[PDB]
């Protein structure tokens, strides 16, 4: 199916505590493969997936050099943003950046993105056409004008539509054994009596990959609303998720749980029986 490569950067100023924290992590789909942590000992881009360790020293030195360049740019950004918003030096602020590319089942470019946020909110981002910017407010307009005049988008687009996709293909290849896998969810249901007239049915999905999945409850062959928890990581490269529904004691049979996942040839339908 489709695949993606994404880099996530987090920068946090630390008032009166020196240099800002800088964390960068790279992902291929839902699998992290590298990381850089300003507070870690190596001060280098590090591998976080087996298939990426096969990359030579030229790769690691190049990624280390580039991630450090990102860190430096973000270090300046924090000061600049504080000024744009005329905020005091007393408070910590956050800069976040995300960029990468999506490819279809044919491993060909599908979409690109480069988004930037300040204090947990959209600040500026490339439009899906990768040729113009969308600035969230008045302060961000200044950045938009600077980047348009310097033709930033052009170089970013070149990356997002080509280089990004090339590396993604490469990674999907080198990590075929893990990245190009699909682990169907292992499912089951639990039943717990709330009161003497009510019972909650929980539908479980475990050990699946990728994280994408749909768990829907139905009472009499029709969608119904139900608690749904966020898909959570198991810690072994697979994910988990559950959906519960409160049902009148003695009506369990009416309810059915439906599971959709790319690892399931055909959707699953579970019932308390």
């Amino acid at each position: 199916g489709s695949h993606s490569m994404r880099y996530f950067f987090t920068s946090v100023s630390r008032p009166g505590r020196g240099e800002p924290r800088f964390i960068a992590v790279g992902y291929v789909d839902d699998t992290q493969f590298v990381r850089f942590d300003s507070d870690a000992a190596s001060q280098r881009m590090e591998p976080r997936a087996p298939w990426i360790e096969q990359e030579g020293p030229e790769y690691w030195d190049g990624e280390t050099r580039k991630v450090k360049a990102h860190s430096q740019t973000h270090r300046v950004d924090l000061g600049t943003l504080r000024g744009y918003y005329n905020q005091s030096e007393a408070g910590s602020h956050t800069v976040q950046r995300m960029y990468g590319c999506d490819v279809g089942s044919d491993w060909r470019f599908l979409r690109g993105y480069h988004q930037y946020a300040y204090d947990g909110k959209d600040y500026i981002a490339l439009k899906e056409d990768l040729r113009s910017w969308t600035a969230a407010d008045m302060a961000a307009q200044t950045t938009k004008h600077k980047w348009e005049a310097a033709h930033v988008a052009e170089q970013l687009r070149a990356y997002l539509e080509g280089t990004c996709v090339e590396w993604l293909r490469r990674y999907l290849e080198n990590g075929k054994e893990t990245l190009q896998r699909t682990d169907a969810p292992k499912t089951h249901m639990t039943h717990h009596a709330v009161s003497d007239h009510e019972a909650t049915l929980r539908c479980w999905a475990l050990s699946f990959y990728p994280a994408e999945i749909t768990l829907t409850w139905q009472r009499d062959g029709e969608d119904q609303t139900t608690e749904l928890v966020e898909t959570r990581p198991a810690g072994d490269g697979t994910f988990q998720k559950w959906a519960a529904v409160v049902v009148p004691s003695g009506q369990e049979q009416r309810y059915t749980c439906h599971v959709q996942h790319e690892g399931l040839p055909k959707p699953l339908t579970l019932r308390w029986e």
Binding site: Y7, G26, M45, Y59, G62, E63, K66, V67, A69, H70, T73, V76, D77, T80, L81, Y84, Y99, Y116, Y123, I124, T143, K146, W147, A150, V152, Q155, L156, Y159, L160, T163, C164, W167
Partner: peptide, 9 residues
């Protein structure tokens, strides 16, 4: 692999 040409705001 990381990109380049990332300028300051």
């Amino acid at each position: 692999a990381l990109g380049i040409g990332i300028l300051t705001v």
